[PDB]
Ligand binder design. Structure first.
Ligand SMILES: Nc1ncnc2c1c(Br)cn2[C@@H]1O[C@H](CO)[C@@H](O)[C@H]1O
Ligand SMILES: [Br-]
Ligand SMILES: [Co+2]
Ligand code: NA
Length: 338
């Protein structure tokens, strides 16, 4: 059955099942990576994000081999488990992106999606191949997600002040703590492309950690964590993860603290990716804090002593947080969140 048993279709479906004409006509490309392509579209008056990944074929795509169904399953399972946290009780968070559906699709790439792909290439430029070379037996996974807003990297110059950065870090830390508590989760790839921001009218956001409910002032933004391609979790001692023990390229990047995090995770876990090392979540949170202080630039600087105080508190977080053992330890014990 399609969509993990929640769609009535069996066997692959055509793209038209996921992207009926009007939905497909409203697709605009919003993102990419070596994995494939991300489109935004609308249905029932509501934006969604569609992630499309080629699988099972022999062609290089964006310079890399396609994943098998077995290799893509972890991302699908982890997307679902983290989405479900929004509806749980003892460990509840809306801080991971909602998963609406997952389909296995068969066919060549829709020409209307090529149109969208071309528009992005013309205006922003793409590092990917134009996905026009797939035959009509090609398989894809199509993941339909809640539209989460705009990534933190694209918001580098767009946020109001460091007070917003405090809310963002708090929301991230809380979501990761809840996922640690419920699922022994590690994100493992939480670069600033994978932190999404969208406007909310809610003044505060709610989470529950091990049965204790708390709130976070929103500063008008809701944070969603995305992209579980490197993630790990477990339920009842069954571990779901991406084994990168024999990957070379992942540990040889340069030019950004991001690339050190892969090496630092490998140090922490002795290259055993099945194990649970929630310190990796601290490492990513440190990388994000570092971005907030070094690369983000805010419309309003810390001009008053009260704002210089928030700056000082985030600088204090940056220099102390690596002495905490997990996001849960940070959330529960760090002074920033009291
Ligand atoms: N659910 C979503 N809502 C909004 N944008 C999304 C997503 C998923 C990816 N993306 C963008 O696609 C990029 C690549 O992954 C990300 O960095 C984001 O910019
Ligand atoms: Br994603
Ligand atoms: Co369906
Ligand atoms: Na969310």
């Amino acid at each position: 059955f399609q969509s993990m048993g929640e769609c009535s279709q069996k066997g692959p479906v055509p793209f038209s099942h996921c992207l009926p004409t009007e939905k497909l006509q409203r697709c605009e490309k919003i993102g990419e990576g070596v994995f494939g392509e991300v489109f935004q579209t609308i249905a029932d008056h509501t934006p969604v994000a569609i992630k499309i990944i080629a699988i099972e074929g022999p062609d290089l795509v964006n310079g890399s081999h396609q994943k098998t169904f077995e290799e893509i399953l972890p991302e699908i399972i982890i997307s679902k488990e983290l989405s479900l946290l929004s509806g749980e009780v003892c460990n509840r968070t809306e801080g991971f992106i909602g998963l609406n559906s997952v389909h296995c699709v068969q066919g060549s790439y829709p020409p209307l999606l090529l149109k969208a792909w071309d528009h992005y290439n013309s205006t922003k430029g793409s590092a990917n191949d134009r996905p026009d070379f797939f035959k009509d037996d090609q398989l894809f996974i199509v993941l339909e997600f809640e539209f989460g807003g705009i990534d933190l990297e694209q918001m580098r110059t767009k946020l109001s002040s460091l007070a917003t950065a405090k809310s963002i870090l708090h929301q991230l830390t809380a979501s990761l703590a809840v996922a640690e508590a419920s699922l022994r989760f590690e994100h493992r790839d939480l670069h600033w492309g994978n932190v999404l921001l969208k406007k909310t009218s809610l003044k505060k956001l709610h989470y529950t950690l091990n049965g204790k409910s708390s709130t976070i002032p929103s500063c008008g933004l809701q944070v969603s964590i995305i992209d579980y391609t490197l993630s790990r979790l477990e339920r009842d001692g069954i571990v779901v993860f991406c084994d990168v023990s024999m990957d070379e390229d992942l540990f040889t990047g340069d030019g950004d603290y991001q690339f050190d995090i892969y090496r630092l995770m490998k140090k922490e876990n002795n290259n055993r990716w099945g194990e649970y090392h929630p310190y990796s979540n601290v490492l990513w949170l440190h990388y994000l804090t570092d971005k907030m202080l070094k690369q983000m630039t805010f419309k309003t600087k810390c001009n008053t002593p009260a704002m210089k105080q928030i700056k000082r508190k985030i600088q204090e977080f940056h220099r102390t947080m690596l002495n905490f053992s997990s996001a849960t330890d940070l959330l529960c014990q760090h002074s920033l969140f009291k």
